[PDB]
């Protein structure tokens, strides 16, 4: 477990349990316009269903697309550098970070950035809050904060949802579709759904490990986000595959001991779908797909 990757499995398992507090869930819903999100979703399903060309259904799937949209356009803002608190002007990052006074420790900030104003000769503090409850107040950050808060919200609305950690310093969410009987990629920071090749093929990222974390499961979902499986294998130099899989298997077995027989059985039937996806790498289409930039 002395590799960093195995240490982060443990931290993320813990962290994800936070979304299960029903008061935190309440408070999250205190923030979401849940009826209007659901009223708009009913309407798109109404019209989708007029032309039966629209098959299966999509319904809580339509709702999911309303959540992504609102979070991005109404709820949360991006931070590059915060404005100066004295003069309102631009600030610039100091390479040397600040130290979390005390209240910044209370809300899970280990890192605090110094956003300096030269005109005022003034340090402005940007804490990197890790407690999702704090983020429902601040409503801003970079993609850590966005994914953290968005995953809480999904769970608050009764979606099954994973917090997804990419070893190359990005994070996002996955949400289950009972209609389609599969997990869907969701990136709130980017307003994207069900486009898992965005990172490798759209951003040209060289991926290694992507691990999903939920109340029920830890899952190595790497293979969903790549069509260059050999290349990804060449960067998986951080831990033995054996040890990674035994650790995840161990953690699943341990954590699933307190679910029902029927539920464990369901999870097994679902895992067949994922694993078949993982041995079914897809074909990039940079000439066709707006978000595809690489062969």
């Amino acid at each position: 477990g002395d590799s960093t990757i195995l240490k982060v499995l443990q931290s993320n398992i813990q962290h994800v349990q936070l979304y299960e507090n029903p008061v935190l869930q309440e408070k999250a819903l205190t923030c979401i316009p849940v009826s209007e999100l659901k009223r708009k979703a009913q309407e798109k399903l109404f019209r989708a269903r007029k032309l039966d060309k629209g098959t299966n259904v999509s319904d809580e799937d339509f709702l999911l697309l309303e959540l992504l949209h609102w979070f991005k356009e109404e709820f949360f803002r991006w931070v590059n550098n915060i404005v100066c608190s004295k003069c309102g002007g631009e600030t610039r990052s100091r390479d040397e970070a600040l130290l979390p006074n005390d209240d910044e420790l209370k809300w899970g900030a280990k890192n605090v950035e110094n956003h300096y104003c030269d005109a005022c000769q003034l340090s402005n503090r940007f804490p990197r809050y890790n407690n999702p409850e704090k983020l429902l107040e601040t409503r801003c950050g970079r993609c850590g904060e966005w994914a953290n808060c968005f995953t809480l919200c999904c769970r608050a609305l009764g979606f099954e949802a994973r917090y997804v950690w990419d070893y190359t310093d990005h994070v996002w969410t996955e949400v289950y579709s009972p209609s389609q009987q599969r997990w869907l990629h969701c990136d709130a920071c980017e307003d994207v759904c069900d486009k898992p090749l965005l990172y490798e093929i759209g951003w040209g990222k060289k991926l290694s490990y992507i691990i999903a974390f939920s109340k029920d499961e830890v899952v190595d979902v790497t293979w969903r986000y790549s069509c260059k499986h050999d290349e990804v294998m060449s960067r998986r130099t951080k831990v033995k595959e054996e040890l990674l899989r035994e650790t995840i298997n161990g953690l699943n077995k341990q954590r699933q001991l307190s679910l029902s027989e029927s539920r464990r059985k369901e999870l097994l039937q679902r895992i067949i779908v994922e694993l078949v996806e993982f041995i079914s790498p897809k074909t990039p289409r940079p000439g066709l797909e707006h978000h595809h930039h690489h062969h």
Binding site: D220, R245, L268, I271, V276, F278, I279
Partner: protein, 61 residues
């Protein structure tokens, strides 16, 4: 093996092998899901059913 040998040591297929070994009854469901998601892989499995089944049933740690 035949064309499907490159599955053998893939970490996700090692995972699949483990699951099918612990849950023999999932074999029909696995083959049916393969047919849906990867029909060309199913076509390959149908030409060499023994080799595929041999691979699924080889233990891994």
């Amino acid at each position: 093996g035949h064309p499907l040998e490159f599955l053998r040591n893939q970490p996700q297929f090692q995972q699949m092998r483990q699951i099918i070994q612990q849950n023999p009854s999932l074999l029909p469901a696995l083959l049916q899901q393969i047919g849906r998601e990867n029909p060309q892989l199913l076509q390959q499995i149908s030409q060499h059913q023994e080799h595929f089944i041999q691979m699924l049933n080889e233990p891994v740690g």
